[PDB]
Design a protein around this ligand. Sequence first.
Ligand SMILES: Cc1cc2nc3c(=O)[nH]c(=O)nc-3n(C[C@H](O)[C@H](O)[C@H](O)COP(=O)(O)O)c2cc1C
Ligand SMILES: Cc1cc2nc3c(=O)[nH]c(=O)nc-3n(C[C@H](O)[C@H](O)[C@H](O)COP(=O)(O)O)c2cc1C
Ligand SMILES: Cc1cc2nc3c(=O)[nH]c(=O)nc-3n(C[C@H](O)[C@H](O)[C@H](O)COP(=O)(O)O)c2cc1C
Ligand SMILES: Cc1cc2nc3c(=O)[nH]c(=O)nc-3n(C[C@H](O)[C@H](O)[C@H](O)COP(=O)(O)O)c2cc1C
Ligand SMILES: Cc1cc2nc3c(=O)[nH]c(=O)nc-3n(C[C@H](O)[C@H](O)[C@H](O)COP(=O)(O)O)c2cc1C
Ligand SMILES: [Cl-]
Ligand SMILES: [Cl-]
Ligand SMILES: [Cl-]
Ligand SMILES: [Cl-]
Ligand SMILES: [Kr]
Ligand SMILES: [Kr]
Ligand SMILES: [Kr]
Ligand SMILES: [Kr]
Ligand SMILES: [Kr]
Ligand SMILES: [Kr]
Ligand SMILES: [Kr]
Ligand SMILES: [Kr]
Ligand SMILES: [Kr]
Ligand SMILES: [Kr]
Ligand SMILES: [Kr]
Ligand SMILES: [Kr]
Ligand SMILES: [Kr]
Ligand SMILES: [Kr]
Ligand SMILES: [Kr]
Ligand SMILES: [Kr]
Ligand SMILES: [Kr]
Ligand SMILES: [Kr]
Ligand SMILES: [Kr]
Ligand SMILES: [Kr]
Ligand SMILES: [Kr]
Ligand SMILES: [Kr]
Ligand SMILES: [Kr]
Ligand SMILES: [Kr]
Ligand SMILES: [Kr]
Ligand SMILES: [Kr]
Ligand SMILES: [Kr]
Ligand SMILES: [Kr]
Lengths: 408, 409, 408, 408, 203
Amino acid sequence: MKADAVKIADGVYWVGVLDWDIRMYHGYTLNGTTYNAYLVFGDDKVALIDNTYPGTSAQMWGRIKDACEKEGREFKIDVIVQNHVEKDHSGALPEIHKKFPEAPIYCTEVAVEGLVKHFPSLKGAPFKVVKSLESIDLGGKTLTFLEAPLLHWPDSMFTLYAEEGILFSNDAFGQHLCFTQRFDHEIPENILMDANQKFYANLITPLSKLVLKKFKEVIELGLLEKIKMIAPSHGQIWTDPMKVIGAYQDFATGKCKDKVTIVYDTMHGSTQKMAHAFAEGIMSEGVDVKMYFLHNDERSEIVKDILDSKAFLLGAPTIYDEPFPSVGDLIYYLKGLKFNRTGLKRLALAFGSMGGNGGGTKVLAEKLKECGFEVLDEYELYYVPTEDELEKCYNMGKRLAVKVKEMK
Amino acid sequence: MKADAVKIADGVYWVGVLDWDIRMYHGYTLNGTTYNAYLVFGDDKVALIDNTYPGTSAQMWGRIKDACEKEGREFKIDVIVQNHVEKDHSGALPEIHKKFPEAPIYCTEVAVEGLVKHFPSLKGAPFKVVKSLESIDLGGKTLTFLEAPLLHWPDSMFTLYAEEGILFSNDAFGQHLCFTQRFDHEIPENILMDANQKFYANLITPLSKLVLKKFKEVIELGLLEKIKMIAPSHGQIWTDPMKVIGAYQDFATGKCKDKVTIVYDTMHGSTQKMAHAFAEGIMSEGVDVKMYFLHNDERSEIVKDILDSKAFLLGAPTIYDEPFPSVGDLIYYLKGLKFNRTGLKRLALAFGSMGGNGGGTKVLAEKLKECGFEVLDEYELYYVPTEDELEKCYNMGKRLAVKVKEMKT
Amino acid sequence: MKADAVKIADGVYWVGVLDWDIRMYHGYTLNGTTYNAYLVFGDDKVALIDNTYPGTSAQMWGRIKDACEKEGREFKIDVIVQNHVEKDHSGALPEIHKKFPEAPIYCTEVAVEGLVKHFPSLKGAPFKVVKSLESIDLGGKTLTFLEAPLLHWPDSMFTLYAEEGILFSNDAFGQHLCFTQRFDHEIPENILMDANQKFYANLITPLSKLVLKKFKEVIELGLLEKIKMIAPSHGQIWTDPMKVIGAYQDFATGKCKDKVTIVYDTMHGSTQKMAHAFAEGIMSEGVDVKMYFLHNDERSEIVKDILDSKAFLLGAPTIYDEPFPSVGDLIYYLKGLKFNRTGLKRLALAFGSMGGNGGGTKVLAEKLKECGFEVLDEYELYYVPTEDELEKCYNMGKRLAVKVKEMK
Amino acid sequence: MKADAVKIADGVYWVGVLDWDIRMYHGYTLNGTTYNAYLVFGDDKVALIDNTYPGTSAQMWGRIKDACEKEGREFKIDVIVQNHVEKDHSGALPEIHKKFPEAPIYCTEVAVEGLVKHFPSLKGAPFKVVKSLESIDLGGKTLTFLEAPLLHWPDSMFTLYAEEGILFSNDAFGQHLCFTQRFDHEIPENILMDANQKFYANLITPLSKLVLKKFKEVIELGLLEKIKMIAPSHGQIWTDPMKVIGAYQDFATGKCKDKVTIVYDTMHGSTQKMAHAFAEGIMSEGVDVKMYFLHNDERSEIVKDILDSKAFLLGAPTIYDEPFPSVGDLIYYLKGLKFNRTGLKRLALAFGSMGGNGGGTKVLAEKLKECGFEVLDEYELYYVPTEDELEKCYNMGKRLAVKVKEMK
Amino acid sequence: PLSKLVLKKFKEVIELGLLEKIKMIAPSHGQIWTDPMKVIGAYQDFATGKCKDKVTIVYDTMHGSTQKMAHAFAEGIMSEGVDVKMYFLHNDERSEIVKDILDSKAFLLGAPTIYDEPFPSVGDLIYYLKGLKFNRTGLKRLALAFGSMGGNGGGTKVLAEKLKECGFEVLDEYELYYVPTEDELEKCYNMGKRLAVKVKEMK
Ligand SMILES: Cc1cc2nc3c(=O)[nH]c(=O)nc-3n(C[C@H](O)[C@H](O)[C@H](O)COP(=O)(O)O)c2cc1C
Ligand SMILES: Cc1cc2nc3c(=O)[nH]c(=O)nc-3n(C[C@H](O)[C@H](O)[C@H](O)COP(=O)(O)O)c2cc1C
Ligand SMILES: Cc1cc2nc3c(=O)[nH]c(=O)nc-3n(C[C@H](O)[C@H](O)[C@H](O)COP(=O)(O)O)c2cc1C
Ligand SMILES: Cc1cc2nc3c(=O)[nH]c(=O)nc-3n(C[C@H](O)[C@H](O)[C@H](O)COP(=O)(O)O)c2cc1C
Ligand SMILES: Cc1cc2nc3c(=O)[nH]c(=O)nc-3n(C[C@H](O)[C@H](O)[C@H](O)COP(=O)(O)O)c2cc1C
Ligand SMILES: [Cl-]
Ligand SMILES: [Cl-]
Ligand SMILES: [Cl-]
Ligand SMILES: [Cl-]
Ligand SMILES: [Kr]
Ligand SMILES: [Kr]
Ligand SMILES: [Kr]
Ligand SMILES: [Kr]
Ligand SMILES: [Kr]
Ligand SMILES: [Kr]
Ligand SMILES: [Kr]
Ligand SMILES: [Kr]
Ligand SMILES: [Kr]
Ligand SMILES: [Kr]
Ligand SMILES: [Kr]
Ligand SMILES: [Kr]
Ligand SMILES: [Kr]
Ligand SMILES: [Kr]
Ligand SMILES: [Kr]
Ligand SMILES: [Kr]
Ligand SMILES: [Kr]
Ligand SMILES: [Kr]
Ligand SMILES: [Kr]
Ligand SMILES: [Kr]
Ligand SMILES: [Kr]
Ligand SMILES: [Kr]
Ligand SMILES: [Kr]
Ligand SMILES: [Kr]
Ligand SMILES: [Kr]
Ligand SMILES: [Kr]
Ligand SMILES: [Kr]
Ligand SMILES: [Kr]
């Protein structure tokens, strides 16, 4: 395939892959994404930083050939860097190693066993284990490695091109966006920061304390102000790195809007009527609302909006003494994401309709507490809400919205 | 609209609704269903048994008018029977009451409050509370009411047209099928019994002990052999009532096949490779397999197959120390269904791939035990399975299949 | 249901409905919408302008009661205005007429028969046929009716509250957005203008000549500068009317970006490889690309992007001498939309893979011409593209992108 | 992967792949499928007949190894047969050739170029072109080839294991079913014959005249009664070959039931009300009805039911002078399938609702005629049907059902 | 019956840019066209259902009663300024009849009942119309069936069924007993008048 590389600095190219057509990626909804790989031309050695998903390398190889041609160099890679073992960034490593078998593969210690377990043909490949602050010289360009375990996997690391302050952060600071434009400043800010928020919410939330720890280490090494560009493994390249670092600082410390996310499911529409009545009460106080119906909507957008919501409402009818089962998916996901690690226990209310002994709302309230929410109340009613019962939902939403606006 | 009634006995007509186009109904997948309503012409009184979902009454009214015309009677309903309050069978009750305000509404005591809570316009309607074995005379035809609380709601009852032994069972013995054919014998048996199995699995499983209790009461009264037809609220009418009663007896007592249902989810395909390797081991012992991938498949077909499986395998990768979240939906559903109430604790294995501390399979094993399964083992491995690890999956499946064939149903 | 009205001017309220949960509306994908209805309090008469979809009136009635309470007036409607017969705006008219049977219903001549055909209970209702420039006095407030046939139905009209210059335009200038925020300035501009573009593309494109004719008529009346607010029947209220009028002028006259929309379907991935190779050639010239895969994507987003694209590529494999059948849906839609009515014949290429006699690409080229595109070339190849064939796709895309940049 | 082979005759094994999880395959909906491959152990040579989809060979290799072990033979393929080039049966040919580079590949003349175009690594592979009635000796077992062009691709052929009368028919007589049971007699007949009908409808309909021509040739060679087993490339193996040959004869000659398939789409429900009223009229005559709503349903099930229906109804509302665009997909598909090639012109009616000039129903009637249907009537009405208009739909359906019953 | 193939051949010829290049059409019968666009234009009109405000009436009779009905329908049609061509199957033959149907918006067919069937001469025209398939022109011409009878009747019901099979839009049918009365001829006139109004409403 013929495909052009994109220069991001002198002798540095994006040689990634545009996954135009993907719409679901591990339960994360998106309108395509990219697998960003980078090619650094030192005077002596050419290094490839990360690669792409298995079967998607046609664009990558085309862009690598284009970059070598633009540099007046032979089609050759001398050094391979693997920041992360997950196959969306390591999937072409078997073919890169087969093509360039003498190129060493720089990665963390735990990455070696992980990569060989993913790709058995790499057994006996020239792996070179790296540690934080160790560097390699490409000839006028230096790559410095920085271990970042559990940001987001135990094998994860960042690679810094020291002379120009370009941080190849792999997943950290990435966003699932697929545009012809490669840089942060070339697309609308709302699209960029909404995709960044969704990426943090789904991938970084349980790591919020480690984010702040990594930031303290990066500032104590005096290297924060040296970062001129962040080139992540998905989406746009940050020419304004402090914009995304600032967004991460806000998400990791529980900075939220005066906003409530409401999620519900229904069989006969009664829980839906309750959800809409809670929203009316919240809106009467000028507090924003995002409304999700689990029949149609899915977990990755829901958790994006919870991330900057001060409160979360969850509603479902009772079926055989349990809440309607679709909530189980979201609850299992919230149990993993651990929103309390942002330093904020978001307020919550459980609600629902029932037709006998009930009990679904009590289960929801207990699960919301396990997920780190501050459950203020619960409201369960019999079949179709009356006018007085919808006014109670409105009043509960109104009183919640007052508490939301009072919250620091 | 103009729509023909279907005669099911002398002076008795199906006047129901064909919901051709519905594909999802409270998370239950289907290729349409029906809302069966019945019109009984006594010499003195015409009785309507159940009705239909709100906004779907055009067919029902057309069939009622057609039946009255065929009987040489006025377009009039004298008696309304409401077997169950759920709006798929009571949704046209406000219109029926408005059209025929003097017709008494026969239902259980708890049904009255439930119907008025659903439909405020019924406040002050002529409700007539009934109890088990109470009857009403329509003139040469008798309707006898039998209370059936929690089969499937606390308001539920059956209505028996005594002289012909026609049991209007409402949801009990129903199936979500939408055909032009109205009777059990007019469609392929495999379609009928598969839909019946799906209906039991999703709606009756947690009531399995009450099913057997209701069957004991009906046998003690001597009414079991008097039932000549079962006319439920969805799908086909049973001209062979002992066929569906027999199927219910088997499902309520844990009669299963030499069959394993395997369910999994995956992000990068490793848990999928494990699932397929367990299946190969099971199949090597001549044991049947049903395979479900939670990315594409949904809870109502899964639980249909668990109902006559002797074993259930559940697999998922680990994400933030938890199993992949799609399993949470199925687990919440299985917690409600309580398959252990069938009198059998189906065998189970939990499995999955992981990339660090793991833990997802220990959560799965714990949840499977809470859902009433007999968990025999759990197997978690690191990233992509090796050949030896897929042979271990095969061997575990083979050993499970041996134990499945040793179980006596 | 208790739900607050929103004041939009002195004695004028939004009393609409938030359809939070709808995700598809006549094949148009969305994240909810609104059915905007308005209540105008004259000193003598209270007018309700449009209403909502059948079964969704709970919010509307709540907001009408709230507005009457805020005005110190009884819960009473004196005048009913029906701008458009489509049931998303007329669906509550039977229940409004039943509650207020003496309130006249103002609508166009053709609307009367259309409303009675939709709602048989309105036979004998007090209909009052209106014509362009006819007005009614509410007591200190005047409503002037302006006929807009085929903008977008034969019955359509606008209602102008003359003293404040508020144009109740019904569907015209609407957008399918459901937010707690009611005004244009309260949401991100990119979201607003993207939704406006989607609404124009799907609903207004074939009416582009009538839009320009309606604009000349409005300027000839000296009434364009007198519009201070446009309050449409869906989405945000325009406090900046010239922003949306300007967008409509651009869409109605073929003002496009240096941008190509590519649409394809595939069974075995060959047509997909071609589509991605055309994109690489286009991007090499700095021309933007939007890529759609018919397996996943749907017609309403596709036509949004065609609207401001200078070129359109359509690709599909051959099956039984015909193009893959999913293209038939999009082609039937484009035949109805008539993009040539914008005054521009967008450039086009047809492409695809085949395994025998072929012919699918020739059908695509013929259909693209029937849909008003200027078809420049066709490219059909045998099974999996070779490297030379993907370079041909790249070169064709490059040559197209040069022609796109040369267009006016 | 460890996976057992299944013996189907002395020295003959199924070594195929169970695709448990696939739900859509080129727009064909299914609950998984199989890629059947077969291993024939001659005294001198072991032949592999067909293989599997790319990336799905783990099961196949496991079963080949299991079969070789059971036969006391080396893990070695001496002969490769490729009946058809489509990648669901040829996708592992690159792997197989790389492992056994001296094994000749038997295929048709046109298959060679098709396979090398799909798989460039096969350039220079030992292809052996075969013609009809040419045979190869494996040592006590003979494989005879039989060209079957356009059944279903130009490259297609059947392979006959002469001594046992086992016809490896590739796609012909296949069904998209994925069960642990391998034979026709081991699953419920309704499931088997419904899947066989769906496979014929979607893949064989336009080839109906070639099916009857191939059956003439097979009877002229005296081979029909000698066929003891049909082992196709998907689904169950026919131990009762005359059951599927008989079904194919019926489908190829227009043998239908007293049955009408009704398909429609709707925006506001009026065309749906018409569709349901036509069904009531048809059912009043004891004629069966299958109802499809294009919003939810898809082309592959629709055409399955058209195949044994004597009549087909198609309804849609008018949008910008055209029928609702979802019909375009089904019409493009029916144009390719050419149901008139079964020797029957099925009866048809076109219907719909409209709100102005209409015209959608006239387009539907035109298109139904182009698709080979005998269009008897056309009915378009204004907005919501009245009681008299639904009685007209009922009467039209009743009259159609009388004509259906009169068709011999 | 080839009307759709005519239009497909005209698109193929226009796509090749060869239509404006034809200077003369020299066919195998009759006149040579020095004005080719005149006959191509006529073919385009016939292939797309361009008709006149005109009705073709065809009937047969034994004792004259169906003839009196036919003439009374014509009077009603003519009262609306709609043209009429009248054919009597005893004398007239199929090739002139179908010439006039081709640019008629409506077609009337009448015959008496004989042994529960329509008079047999209609069978020849019906078999011919079944082959010609006038519906292939893109127009379903309007039609009425009529006749006289002397017992159980039924001939008109058969005619209506056959007209439907030949692609016509049958609006009504009228069968009467033996010789029409003045009121029955006024009914024929009124039916023809109503038909002619619908004919003028067709575009
Ligand atoms: C299959 C099924 C099982 C139910 N089981 C229970 C139950 O165990 N306890 C209860 O209180 N209500 C039960 N209900 C009643 C529902 O909770 C009740 O209809 C409720 O009003 C539905 O709320 P919704 O309109 O939001 O779906 C059940 C309903 C269904 C359909
Ligand atoms: C977002 C994400 C989070 C993960 N978190 C964990 C974790 O907490 N513990 C663990 O052992 N593995 C974790 N993993 C690694 C996966 O379990 C591992 O990749 C596994 O092999 C996936 O199996 P599959 O191919 O069936 O998807 C995580 C993977 C992802 C994508
Ligand atoms: C069911 C089916 C029917 C086909 N019919 C034809 C045909 O009529 N003419 C043709 O040239 N190719 C035909 N093909 C071959 C495909 O066009 C060919 O495989 C093409 O390369 C598919 O491109 P894709 O990878 O983009 O799907 C057919 C393929 C299938 C699966
Ligand atoms: C966007 C749109 C465009 C329409 N265009 C036309 C048109 O060109 N001609 C027409 O007669 N009706 C037109 N209509 C009106 C519909 O055909 C009419 O509402 C019809 O009754 C819908 O039938 P349904 O309820 O089955 O969807 C249009 C409707 C919509 C929503
Ligand atoms: C041989 C013959 C057979 C007839 N059979 C019937 C018959 O089956 N049913 C009927 O209603 N009239 C029958 N008739 C009566 C004619 O239809 C009746 O005379 C009619 O008015 C003749 O119409 P005409 O004047 O247009 O010929 C028959 C007439 C003849 C001469
Ligand atoms: Cl590998
Ligand atoms: Cl009510
Ligand atoms: Cl109404
Ligand atoms: Cl290859
Ligand atoms: Kr670093
Ligand atoms: Kr590191
Ligand atoms: Kr990360
Ligand atoms: Kr980070
Ligand atoms: Kr930092
Ligand atoms: Kr950082
Ligand atoms: Kr850094
Ligand atoms: Kr009973
Ligand atoms: Kr009862
Ligand atoms: Kr039940
Ligand atoms: Kr029961
Ligand atoms: Kr029983
Ligand atoms: Kr029973
Ligand atoms: Kr009973
Ligand atoms: Kr105006
Ligand atoms: Kr107007
Ligand atoms: Kr509009
Ligand atoms: Kr406009
Ligand atoms: Kr305007
Ligand atoms: Kr205006
Ligand atoms: Kr053969
Ligand atoms: Kr075939
Ligand atoms: Kr065949
Ligand atoms: Kr055959
Ligand atoms: Kr054969
Ligand atoms: Kr011609
Ligand atoms: Kr011509
Ligand atoms: Kr020509």
